[PDB]
C-alpha cells in the first residue's frame, strides 16, 4: 500500500489468508510477566551490634540484563506492590551457625533510621543484643532460623508505600532544591522501602533478595534496549538454543 509517512503513525499491508491468532498475545501482558519472584540484588546481613546500612528496595536501576531489568525501563512510570523472599546461601561450612535468627524488618517509604542498640536478651550470663529498630512492632518483622531449616528463607506482601501517585523511573529535573549532581535522576523516594537484616550470622552467608511485582501498572512507553551487539550485516545472530542443529 502507498504510504504517506512522516506523520508518525506506522502503516500496514495485510496479506491473503491473514493467519489465525492462538496464544492470544497473553504472554506479553505487563502485569503478568512481572508477577514472578525474580532474583535481583544480593547483600550481606548485619551483626546485631553497631550501626546499620538500611537497605533500600529500589528495583528501577537495571544494568545486568536478566530480562527483568529491561522490562521495568520499557515504561516511564510504574506502580505495583511488592513481595519479597530472602534466602541466604551459606558461604562456608553450613554447620557453624547452630541457630541464626535473622531479623528481617521491612520499612515503608519515609520511616526513620538511626539504629544503635537498645535491646538485650538476659540469660545466665553473656546476653545478646538486638538492633533497636530491628525488634518487633509497627513495621513487620520475620524471625527465621538458619539451622536445619529446609529453606533458610521467608517471604511476604509489601503494598505500595511511596507518596507519588505513581513511580517515575527516569526523572528529568532533580530531587531536592539543591540542584546537585546525584539528585538528577533521584527524586525523593521513587521506591518500595527498605529492609534491615541482622542475625548472629552476617558472615557465613548472603541472601538473594527477590521481588514479586503484583498489580504492575505501566505508563508511558519507552524504547526497549537491544541487549545484544550487532552481528555481521545481511545475516543471522546464532545463540545455542533448545532447538539449534545438533
Amino acid at each position: 500500500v502507498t504510504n504517506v509517512g512522516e506523520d508518525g503513525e506506522p502503516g500496514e499491508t495485510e496479506p491473503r489468508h491473514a493467519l489465525s491468532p492462538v496464544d492470544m498475545h497473553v504472554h506479553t501482558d505487563v502485569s503478568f510477566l512481572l508477577d514472578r519472584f525474580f532474583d535481583v540484588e544480593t547483600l550481606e546481613l548485619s551483626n546485631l551490634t553497631g550501626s546499620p546500612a538500611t537497605h533500600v528496595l529500589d528495583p528501577f536501576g537495571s544494568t545486568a540484563q536478566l530480562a527483568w531489568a529491561r522490562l521495568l525501563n520499557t515504561c516511564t512510570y510504574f506502580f505495583s506492590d511488592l513481595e519479597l523472599s530472602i534466602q541466604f546461601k551459606f558461604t562456608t561450612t553450613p554447620s557453624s551457625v547452630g541457630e541464626g535468627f535473622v531479623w528481617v524488618k521491612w520499612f515503608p517509604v519515609g520511616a526513620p533510621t538511626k539504629t544503635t542498640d537498645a535491646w538485650q536478651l538476659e540469660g545466665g550470663g553473656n546476653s545478646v543484643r538486638i538492633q533497636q529498630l530491628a525488634v518487633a512492632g509497627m513495621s513487620p518483622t520475620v524471625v527465621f532460623k538458619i539451622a536445619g531449616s529446609r529453606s533458610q528463607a521467608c517471604g511476604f506482601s509489601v503494598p505500595y508505600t511511596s507518596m507519588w501517585r505513581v513511580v517515575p523511573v527516569f526523572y528529568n529535573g532533580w530531587g531536592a532544591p539543591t540542584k546537585e549532581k546525584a539528585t538528577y535522576n533521584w527524586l525523593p523516594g521513587a521506591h518500595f522501602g527498605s529492609i534491615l537484616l541482622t542475625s548472629d550470622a552476617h558472615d557465613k552467608g548472603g541472601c538473594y533478595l527477590r521481588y514479586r511485582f503484583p498489580r504492575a501498572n505501566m505508563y508511558c512507553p519507552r524504547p526497549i534496549p537491544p541487549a545484544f551487539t550487532r552481528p555481521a550485516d545481511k545475516t543471522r545472530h546464532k545463540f545455542p538454543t533448545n532447538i539449534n542443529k545438533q
Partner: protein, 226 residues
C-alpha cells in the same frame, strides 16, 4: 479432631512462578489515584502501533543511484535476530521470550530531493535457494513495485508461511524453524534528478511495524551477552 495431611516430597522448596502470592505483612494501605495517560497492559500492543528503524550498514536507510539496476538494494534473513532487525523495538522486545508467529510490515520512506524520482522493487524470497542476486532472478517470487513521486513512502507486508505454528525469536544454524527467508528491495529503475549535479543520491527509510497477526509467546531469561 486434627485434620490428616501428607506433604508432597517437594514440599519445603522454592518455586519462582507459583500461581499464588505470599503472606500480607502490611495491610489496609489505600493507594492514591493516577492521572497519567499513555498507559499500557500489553507489550505486543506498543510494537504493533509503532515502527522502528532497521539498522542497514549503521544507518536506517539504503541509497538509490542512477547507476544501479541489477544488483540487490537491501537483503536480510527474516529472523528476529538478523542484522537489520536487531535494533528495532519489535526485535528487542522479542528477546524476553522464545517464540513469535507473525508477518511483519515495512515502510519505505523515500527522502530524496523533491526533484527526484526513483520508481523501484521489493521482494520476499521464501527459504530454498542461496539468495537470488538480480531482480531477474528475484522477480519470479513475491514482489511489489513502487514509484516515488507523489506517494512519499510505501508499505510491504512480509507474511508468515511455514509448517510450524511458532518460530524462533532467536536465530541459529540453518533450521527449518529459524529462517523464514529474506527480504529484498531492488532498483527496478535507476534514480533520476533535475541535474545529476545537485542530486546525486536519494535515500529511503526502512521502518518496521509489527504485523497484524504477530505475537510473542514464552518468556525466557536472558542468556549471556554476546
Amino acid at each position: 479432631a486434627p485434620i490428616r495431611v501428607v506433604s508432597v516430597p517437594e514440599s519445603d522448596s522454592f518455586m519462582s512462578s507459583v500461581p499464588d502470592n505470599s503472606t500480607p505483612l502490611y495491610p489496609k494501605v489505600v493507594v492514591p489515584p493516577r492521572q497519567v495517560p499513555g498507559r499500557f497492559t500489553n507489550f505486543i500492543d506498543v510494537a504493533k502501533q509503532t515502527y522502528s528503524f532497521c539498522s542497514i550498514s549503521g544507518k536506517p536507510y539504503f541509497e538509490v543511484t542512477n547507476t544501479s539496476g541489477d544488483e540487490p538494494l537491501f537483503q536480510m534473513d527474516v529472523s528476529l535476530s538478523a542484522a537489520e532487525l536487531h535494533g528495532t523495538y519489535v526485535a528487542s522486545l522479542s528477546s524476553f521470550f522464545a517464540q513469535y508467529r507473525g508477518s511483519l510490515n515495512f515502510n519505505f520512506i523515500f527522502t530524496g530531493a523533491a526533484a527526484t524520482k526513483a520508481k523501484f522493487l521489493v521482494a520476499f524470497v521464501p527459504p530454498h535457494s542461496a539468495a537470488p542476486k538480480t531482480r531477474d532472478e528475484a522477480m519470479a517470487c513475491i514482489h511489489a513495485v513502487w514509484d516515488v513521486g507523489l506517494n512519499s513512502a510505501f508499505s510491504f507486508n512480509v507474511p508468515y508461511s511455514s509448517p510450524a505454528d511458532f518460530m524462533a525469536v532467536y536465530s541459529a544454524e540453518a533450521t527449518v524453524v529459524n529462517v523464514s527467508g529474506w527480504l529484498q528491495v531492488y532498483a527496478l529503475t535507476a534514480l533520476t534528478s533535475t541535474d545529476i549535479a545537485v542530486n546525486s543520491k536519494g535515500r529511503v527509510l526502512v521502518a518496521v511495524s509489527a504485523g497484524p497477526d504477530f505475537s510473542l509467546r514464552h518468556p525466557v531469561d536472558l542468556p549471556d551477552k554476546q
